[model samples]
Target: AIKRVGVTDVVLRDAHQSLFATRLRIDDMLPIAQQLDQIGYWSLECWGGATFDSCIRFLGEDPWQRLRLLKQAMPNTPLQMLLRGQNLLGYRHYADDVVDTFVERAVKNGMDVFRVFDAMNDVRNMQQALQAVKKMGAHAQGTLCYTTSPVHNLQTWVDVAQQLAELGVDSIALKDMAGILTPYAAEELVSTLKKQVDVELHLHCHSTAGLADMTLLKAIEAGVDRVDTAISSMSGTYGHPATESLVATLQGTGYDTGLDIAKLEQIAAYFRDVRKKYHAFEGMMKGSDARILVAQVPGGMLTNMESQLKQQNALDKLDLVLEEIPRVREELGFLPLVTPTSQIVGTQAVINVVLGERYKTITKETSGVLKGEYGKTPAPVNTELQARVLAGAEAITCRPADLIAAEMPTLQDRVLQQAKEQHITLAENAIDDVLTIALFDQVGWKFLANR
Candidate 1:
């Protein structure tokens, strides 16, 4: 049986990454809100931790002040915020969770709904977030990021869906975080979940592996209540599937999406200019139209490239990297730009800097300087190494993804060989090589199509 959707929540929140990202302020977001409201989405998920911080930083405005502007611009529209899962990176999406503290503040500022999610199925973490939302009397949503997980099959999904029902969340958002789910999984899981949970079910998909449209089609067939769409000019990373394509697919199925396709085109033109104002993925975003039919690569790979290249002061080199994708594929016969759960590394930046300086001075002063900085190394913690090894196993097991780690033993050996050839003793306590593998290894395009 097909279910009907009353409205949808399109949170541009993930569109905004971390605190360090360039944010779209209220001035930037107001017009977007008005457009989505005009198009009649149930709510706009615009604001989040970074969005609020960006508001204060860029506009000399209070967070509440920005929310008022958004609310005033689209009075009939329900304002929404996407909260970070409490379990991600050892931090809460909201700094404090005094019941209704953040919710009431957002409501006072004009928010109507809160969409919260954990990367992993941390049920207890989600329940606490729901409790906070319930206290404030605002709509609360729980999301299940449908990455590759050991519990991704029907029964496990039913378990999670029922759990959300018990938590009193008003909605369940099924997110294809890694775009790893094939058409088969999408159809099976969506159908099973709808049968298992009574709350509204929303489908959040990515255009990775050319399955965005197919996944949505299956979700709709399986009775998904709502799906997300990005405005034309508001294209996300890695040639994100456009709302236009979604409308086209629903049209193919003889279903009504209630969106003005022509207006979306006009809005796309307007936002394209807005996107151009900021130097976006000029390289990747350019050939979007042609690749729409091809399998969509995971947008996170593109997003991560943007963040890393920008961080490494190689933003100017993005053009070269994009150009290198095909050449790399031709040369390597492999892609280095795919996601695999790898090692985790954190650093004590200031202390590392001091140590570097001390080591450099000792190197200049003594013949054994290389040994002083190197031979005197931080002892590796066996527990930490063992824990990371297990974490690598667990991260893959927890997500709804293809476990390709076993296929790349040669690749892993190559990295280990590189360290050996360079005569670099990788201290177990040192986090460099592990991080390099985790963040830098992109197998699909980065390794293959890119050199």
Candidate 2:
């Protein structure tokens, strides 16, 4: 038996996200969408994560329309989106009904696979979206945001995968955002998970640390089923391994990906020219950045900090901020540095370094982490910091979403009234508009107003 590996190319989503700060527009994506659809990928990571915010906040496109267009253009292949569990792609957790509706509308708009993961790796944060996707008859892929901490180990990863399996996810995605998973560790994780859990496994690793290419090969050897890659022109530095490179590497092996290298090359060559337009957004990270191995931050986070510091003319303070990041991460209980958590930790670390004093001005997102409002961490947060944020109220040990009431009705009314006053036309299914504003209140509304 060949035990062929499957591929999920991230060119439309994470590639631009990692390399150029998620500025790859729908126009650029559509030109080669059909060529991409022809490739026999397990799925194409084409939406969600920062791409949603990037659309409305910067590109001035309706994110819902973007989904419909991509779905229409790439009808042959299943389209995938990375969702933020209870957060539902926003900063904070929304009401359960809101999350359910978002999942419903997303499925209705042609989202086939839902890669739902929480910042804290808390199952409670992901349960609602996972169940919602199942209800919608979509592939509900739960995620394990990979990171190493004093409290994190192989057992924790195994335990988390089991938790997702129990939640009825279709599969599991081991997301290594920092590009930190070594060859041996990747082997152990896939080998053990294949034994313990009877589910398809996917690996998503950044190429920042320059180990993704080898890591994917090792994981395949360990029985990992699928892996994420980017078109060659759009990969490396910040993105994942190149699609053609990986496909070629396994061409004759028993674990071959079964995808054509010629087709992948066409897509890669297409992006080569397309990427030049967005030259302004590119970062200076040339190849494997050793700072990531020690700083333990994703390449995107590193890029953002540099930009943030440069605005204040403190770019020289990067070394100090790098040292402070782990301290802040440890204080916050070793939450996986992805999405909002990455931004949260990075911002706090920058603040600490720039202000010339630690904890001089704690950010609200940091406070949320310390107060247990995000979800349970891998380990308990600093008692002193937790108590300081708590003051007198008990820490929320329950699912953080439990404290929120149903928000759909109220949110609908708000969006409806704003649309009526501004004379903005809502979508045929107004719920899509409602959900957009729900995910990103101000920026979503701003997009609608201009459209």
Candidate 3:
């Protein structure tokens, strides 16, 4: 029997990963938490392993105060924070001792759940995180972030889960980094893990390819106990599936996440307004390559390191926008858009936009999570574009609206064409979208009319 419903807020975390670098202020987080509390969500995910002490010192004067503010605003809701073994922001790698100290702080701050994972392969990663939680007498969990490596079968996954179980984690999370896991993979892993490990298993998926929904569904069918979801249209863009998607699916499925889909949609819309205020376009490209375009400026360096592609040459290549994304990735990297390809795709968009409108091209092939010949599956979808998402396949897509608004300046009118009326714009020329996006944010959608 299910004892309690599970819901998590990724706005703060996802918002930081895609657009901004620092944490969201207490002013921003307070209202969001209050809304989540009113909506009856079980938990609100705020910090992404951001250190309380460092945040107080570096990020803000009232870093610790941010917690108090959120707690006071949403008295009824449990605030969950992300904890890295030592990879939280400033410290990419830390000793076990530092890990212990950080966990203590997270507990004192009223952290209900601890999200612990390692992007890099360091077994001690889980060891240190588990140590801190155990020492502090708080509830903590472990994450098997799948994006670090690609596994082909159930046995590889089972081995990884066993390693996590050995860490004495309270629950298990299959984190689909790069939005790679599909629905079939979700079902297989969840069902298998439930049988193999005698602990609660959860799914924390990203909609890099728009498959977060299908991934959750397969997990549900496979008998997984819980999953992570954001509020409303604040889904996608390297984020967990939207709570509304699950709410709509479980309308009468006998399973209860205790979320209100209509309310979620409403929140999503409100966030869209907030996003439009910001100049963000990543959201619109959620399941397409256009989203990566936004990253070209920020993520361009990483793209060169990961894909070894010449940033300038790659931008010129994408100028033609004629070749499908795979071809672009082929020239940029030997492999497909598994991980680095994803980043390069982001760089290309920015490079193209800076280059000019003449760089836009309408390719016939699919890229990123949309088209997948490799990677794992979380679930299967009806459409080819969506199918890749269900399978945890990486597609070049944009961030969803609410998410865009929550993190970056609203790109509703700028990055997106008629985004005021719809969430997605189906066009290949959706490059340098921010030029128009800037116009929309500065003047009005009318400004984009002449562009």
Candidate 4:
């Protein structure tokens, strides 16, 4: 018998997020929590990512409360979250205390696994969060956001995995958000990583470019310990491979997931109908979008640019924008197009194309990359653009967070004062309130006021 593969179902979190824009509500989620917990998953990725922002900004749910509720219901399974390294759940790099406090609070609120990553793959950026997770006695999974560029290849991933292993991550997660990891590449990469890194390995791949199913199988055959999948109802297109299908594929084999498809189908059946109610929030894609192979970016970014162009009645400029993206990525030092970096690069590309001039209006984020405010790039950025952005100032050569002073005390005081004047009742555990305000400014405060 072969060592069994562990499955992580992203149904409650990523499935709806990928399919319906992260609008999966707390009510729809709670009913399925018990069933989800019964599945012997390595973990249930139920929090973090856009959930926090969507909680406050859109859903008007208290993110900490959502964690507590989910944890109480799913006591058997470890609750996983996608933390953005120094950025936590927010966009900008936070102070060390904020990271520490955030991790601590997350643990207390019942988050068990922290899948920490930095868009730029800077190990230093993830160090604080990883250490904080370890310090708090939660599973810390350091992740490499996989990308294809001149500077990134098999060894680049190997080197990053080594750095994360040195930092003592319990496991390493390879995130192929673009769905660009072909089967052969996955075979070599996963085999090489298993040969080198002496820890559990997890793989997260989107189904955007239609290669995720094969890529995951190749990785599993090469000894990847766990993989992320969505239930069939919410699977495919922008999401991940289906859990039941993967379980069926591996059944009776050495790579068997050991998951009960009957149970998974029950969960899938529930989401199948629940998904219909959220039709207004769904993406336009019915199946795979092969264009990602040429764009070399996540499918979300592709649609985002398309919608933006449509808004401006310049949909024809899309071809120019698509071509502009690679140059923008190269100019920014070959940044991996994921999360905030994807938005930055995509936005910059659109700006460059729409203006009919390159570099005429460099976005603040693009400037930040050139100025070294987001830590070291994989390669040096375009010298001329860096010079222009710097304008005689020196680029930061240290970990960007090194410059930030601890501000938890001051922030706590500010929130308390605001609460006092507004006569608003704070959470009994007020650190959660302080943190909500700390990471998100007006949005968190607004959530509190409305609640």
Q: TM per model?
A: 0.61, 0.95, 0.62, 0.98
Query: What overall lDDT goes with each candidate model?
Result: 0.51, 0.89, 0.53, 0.91
State the lDDT of candidate 3 residue by residue for 1-451, as single tens digits. 4334466666655543443333444555555555667877656776644334334434443334556566777778677776654444333244344355556655675666777765432334466677678667776777776642232357766776787788787887777655656688777778888788888877777666556678888888887777777655555564557678777777666676667776677677766655544444343343534333332221223344334335444544533442333333333222323332345444454444445552254122223323432222322312533443347654422221111222123432335546535454422334223322331233323333332
- Which lDDT tens digits does candidate 2 get at residues 137-238? 999999998888899887888888998999899999999988999888899988999989988999999888988899998998888989999989999987
Please state every model's RMSD to the true fold in angstroms. 16.4, 1.8, 16.3, 1.2
> Residue 81 in model 3: shift from native, Å?
1.9
Give the runs in model 2 whose Cα sits over 4 Å from its true position. Answer: 306-318, 353-357
Give Cα distance to truth, residue 355, candidate 4, Å. 2.0
lDDT per residue for candidate 4 within 1-451, as digits (tens), equals: 2489999889888887788889998999999889999989989999998899898889989999999999999999999999999999886899999999999999999989999999999999999999999999999999999888899988788899999999999999999878888888888988998888788999999998899999999888988899999998889988999999999999999898889999999999999999999999987777788788866768879877888888878899988998899889998889898888898888889989988889899888889999999999999989999989898999998999999999799999999999999988899899999999888998888889998
RMSD of 1: 16.4
For residues 284-333, write the lDDT of model 1, one tens digit per residue.
Answer: 34332333233332444445545655565646655554444333222211
Clashing pairs in 2: none
lDDT measured at residue 221 in model 3 versus the true structure, 0 to 100: 80
Model 3 misplaced regions, further than 4 Å: 1-5, 19-24, 49-61, 120-122, 148-152, 262-266, 281-286, 290-451
Candidate 1, run of 10 with poorest lDDT: 341-350
Q: Which candidate leads in lDDT?
A: 4
> Could you tell me the TM-score of candidate 2?
0.95
